[PDB]
Amino acid sequence: PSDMLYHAGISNPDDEQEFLTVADYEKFMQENNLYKEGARKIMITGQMADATDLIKALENAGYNVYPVQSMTRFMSFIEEVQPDAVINMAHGRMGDKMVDYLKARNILLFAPLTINSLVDEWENDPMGMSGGFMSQSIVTPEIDGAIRPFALFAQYEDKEGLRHSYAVPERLKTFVSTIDNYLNLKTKPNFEKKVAIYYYKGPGQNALTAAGMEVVPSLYNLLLRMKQEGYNISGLPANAQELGKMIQAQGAVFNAYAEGAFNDFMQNGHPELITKEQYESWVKESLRPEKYQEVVDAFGEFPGNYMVTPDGKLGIARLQFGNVVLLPQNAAGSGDNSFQVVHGTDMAPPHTYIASYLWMQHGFKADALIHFGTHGSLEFTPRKQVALCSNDWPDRLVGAVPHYYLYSIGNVGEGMMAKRRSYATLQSYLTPPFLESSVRGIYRELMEKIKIYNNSQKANKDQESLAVKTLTVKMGIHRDLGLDSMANKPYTEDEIARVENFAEELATEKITGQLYTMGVPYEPERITSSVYAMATEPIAYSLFALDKQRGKATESAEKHRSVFTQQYLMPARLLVERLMANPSLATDELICHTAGITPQELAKARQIEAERNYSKEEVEFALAVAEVERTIKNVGNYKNALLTSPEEELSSLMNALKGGYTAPTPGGDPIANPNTLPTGRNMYAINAEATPTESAWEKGIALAKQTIDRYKQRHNDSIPRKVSYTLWSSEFIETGGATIAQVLYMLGVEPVRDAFGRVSDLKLIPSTELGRPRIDVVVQTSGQLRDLAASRLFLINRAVEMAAAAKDDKYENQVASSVIEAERVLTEKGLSPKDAREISTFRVFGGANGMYGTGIQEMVESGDRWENESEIADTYLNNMGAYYGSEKNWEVFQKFAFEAALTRTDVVVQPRQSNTWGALSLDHVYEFMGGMNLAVRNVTGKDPDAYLSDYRNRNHMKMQELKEAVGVESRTTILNPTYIKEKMKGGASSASEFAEVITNTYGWNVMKPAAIDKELWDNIYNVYVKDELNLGVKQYFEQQNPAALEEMTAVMLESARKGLWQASEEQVAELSKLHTEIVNTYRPSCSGFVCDNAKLRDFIASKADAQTATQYKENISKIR
Ligand code: NA
Ligand code: NA
């Protein structure tokens, strides 16, 4: 039978009993005393493995089990039985009917995994799963809302030599305990549950941080909501300021060198004390001997050296209110100050990390674990990628406790690691609101001069050009665009057009305002501005495309930005305002009049759109029409969702804590994807076996052509010899694989799709069709991308090998030349000819030992531990020299392999997809891009070009230069009074952003000196040290967060000391005076720059007064 219920025989377990109706199975259970009155029911579906032991264990635990085998019509059994949970050995997806039933009934769905090998082989595999098997076992079920991808089943051999599937005995106990823990949340009273919450805090006196969120008020609101719901919370303070003071007093973390600080904390913070017996019992119960032996080898015997009493106990910092506990997250590594990774050894966490998590599991005996914000570091510990075993740290540290994780909708790429490696359930929260830059009144007279120039009918237009040039040079714009500043040499038409486009881009930039607090909606003005930002550009660009396709005079609007603003942006804004005033105007006649189409054309477009869910022009016309229709229709829904989301977040969190079901959702910020509202849902990703999709291919081709055209324009019509790429995960998920398309088109290879839409083969483009020589590529990746899509790397390497062997080309083949040069370089280094020939084709690289980052930020920000950039280049070459181009040579390190592949490199490309961060507001951007740039400059001896792929506007993707982007970001955010005044209405979390931006600016100046000017440092000094805008920022920093001001002053002084900034004596004196005054008044914060840099300390002391210097030195020496 194909649809049945099954069970194992009682007298004879070998043969199987089959039943066609639920009544027969119930009678069979009652005959054999398998039925218990009032017990909860569990249904088991699937065919991937043999589940006899699981059924027996669940029955012994005290449940009623229904094993159902039905591939298609399994909903009838579920509706007849009405279980309390569903366990699925998934192969594919179940459908929307299951999601509707789960939402209606509010029950859970689980999905364990199966391994098709022996246990010994599985425990030694560094990957676990990859490809179609991983897509069918993990990726697809997440679209239904499954949780806990736990590895349970494996295979064994008998005497004859036959493979048999079974369940590993050690995993079964943990799985059953987890099921019991999840089911007990529904019946236990709220007054008796115990909850643990984890937050992230900076060292010393720094503030709490999360991605775009104000942390302390959100925590206070959450605690108030929990107290209202009926939980046992006592001792809560009056307001959030008192909570912040208490957290600072009793919840701080310290670095290794600040012995005095935590020695003082031991006698004032009242921490939890752990003895040796408890720790040893917990370790024996939880971990394995070999991993603990590794920990002992790395750090020594218990308790270690960090926060230990003289008696021999360990101290844990926590803050407890009744049955709720708050804890900070410690460091997952060691401050050995050795920046080069040793190949062949992993990193084990110190004693404090393990002690905290084991005390949560066994000492506090928590019923629920919560991670508060984006993002922690638990899910980035070693070793395996997916399908973890008992040797992996996240699996052991999480245990069998329900796990919830608060995450932002703008960082979908990194949530998959938390979902798949720590078994967490994600809860989405919003992003900060958007507004206009309001800088149109500063660059107005320049626009008037340009307008006067454009309307001159004179044959000789030079004086107007001279006036425009004078105004441009006065404002310093010529440095951003790479123009000249000669006395009597007028500009040409193209340069003036570039200046006008730059100014218009400045005028229409969107910025973020005050940070987001849970339980508090935006201001009505911010609601209006966000709804304005979410709807204007789609309508404008779709109308422009529709006008272009019909053959209208769109050349002027495509050539100038002012014309486009005056012809397509203002009418869209007016229409959006009208629709926002009265949502009932959205009629088909309005659509047909706005798009200038007849109703029959609209019907045809709707028919085409429905069929796709014809020639190419019809398809694109229908797509534009559908975009216009959706954007017009959903304005009121946007506003309502924005107004209603904050309450839904708290309600969903409470429902999840009571053991309910959380609905799935996609990811992305509201501007890029409006389908992410309302929030409070669980995010999923795309299938990597179908990438690059049909839509991403054309965009990749266009971007590659734009890159080639720009390089030819800047270098006298010469094409590049080799191009470098960096691959990340979020843009891969949100674009469909456009960067891979760019790489493949640069090589000259195209994908081949089967009948199911999966890409599994490659084809060579003829040289005549290409119209240009082939160009070689080199690629670097991050850990998240390697986890998400590993087969695409194999495709890329295979494409490189295929293109290197193409002969009889009309144009030159540069891939073969690159291979020959790499082989020669390897030969001159002292390698065997066979090894050199084998290695001369490696082109995909990543972090050593499988780490997720580059490890270069720690070396750059330790200014007193290096002198030249060559040391940084060597460290970067060592730390990112592993190879990930094939499965048989997965994670193999060869000396000089990375260096030989970087020869003859001309361009560096970095993707960008989010509207919330830029080049100066994210540290990973400089960490990767500037590191690659520095390595290329050190290897080849010439500084390459740097470009950014702008995906932010899904209807208009483009390519931009790095220095222009830096200029735009600097002119729009940190030197803009509107941004500063909007930020000055927050707290400490808002105040940390300035220090973060200054640190990133210092890092960029270190990596690529030519991209940072002295005038930028001068402007920052004028704004933040002299207060030329008359905003009163010093008082704001004093009343909110002095540590940020200390950090900013220290960073500027370090830049002055290293020679990167050519400051004068007065500026140095003022900075030193301010730094010493703040440190003396408000005590040191002790970050890396302030309390761990001797040369900077001496430099600061030498520039100040003698008594002030002595007081500053004695203040510094107290913490060490
Ligand atoms: Na940093
Ligand atoms: Na990060």
Author numbering: 164 to 776, 899 to 1405
Text lifted from the article:
Here, we provide direct physiological, biochemical, and structural evidence for the anaerobic removal of iron from heme by HmuS, a membrane-bound, NADH-dependent de-chelatase that deconstructs heme to protoporphyrin IX (PPIX) and Fe(II). Phenotypic analyses of B. theta and its transposon insertion mutants demonstrate that HmuS, a large (1469 residues,163 kDa), multidomain membrane protein, is required for using heme as an iron source. HmuS de-chelatase shares the overall 6-domain architecture of these class I chelatases, including the N-terminal “head” (domain I) and “neck” (domain II) domains, followed by domains III–VI, which collectively form the body. The proposed structure-based mechanism for iron removal by HmuS is chemically analogous to the chelatases in both unrelated heme biosynthetic pathways and homologous enzymes in the biosynthetic pathways for chlorophyll and vitamin B12, although the reaction proceeds in the opposite direction.
Cryo-EM single particle analysis was used to determine two related structures of HmuS, each at a global resolution of 2.6 Å. With the exception of a disordered N-terminal domain in the second structure, they are highly similar. In contrast, heme density is absent in the disordered structure. These two structural snapshots are consistent with a mobile head domain in the absence of heme, which adopts an ordered conformation when heme is bound at the subunit interface. His-538 in the first motif and His-1209 in the second extend toward each other, directly across the middle of the putative active site, where they coordinate a strong spherical density, which we have modeled as a sodium cation due to the inclusion of NaCl in the buffer (EV4 and EV5). The flexible hinge connecting the head domain to the neck and the proximity of the MRI suggest that ferric heme can access a binding site at the head/neck interface, possibly fed by the MRI.
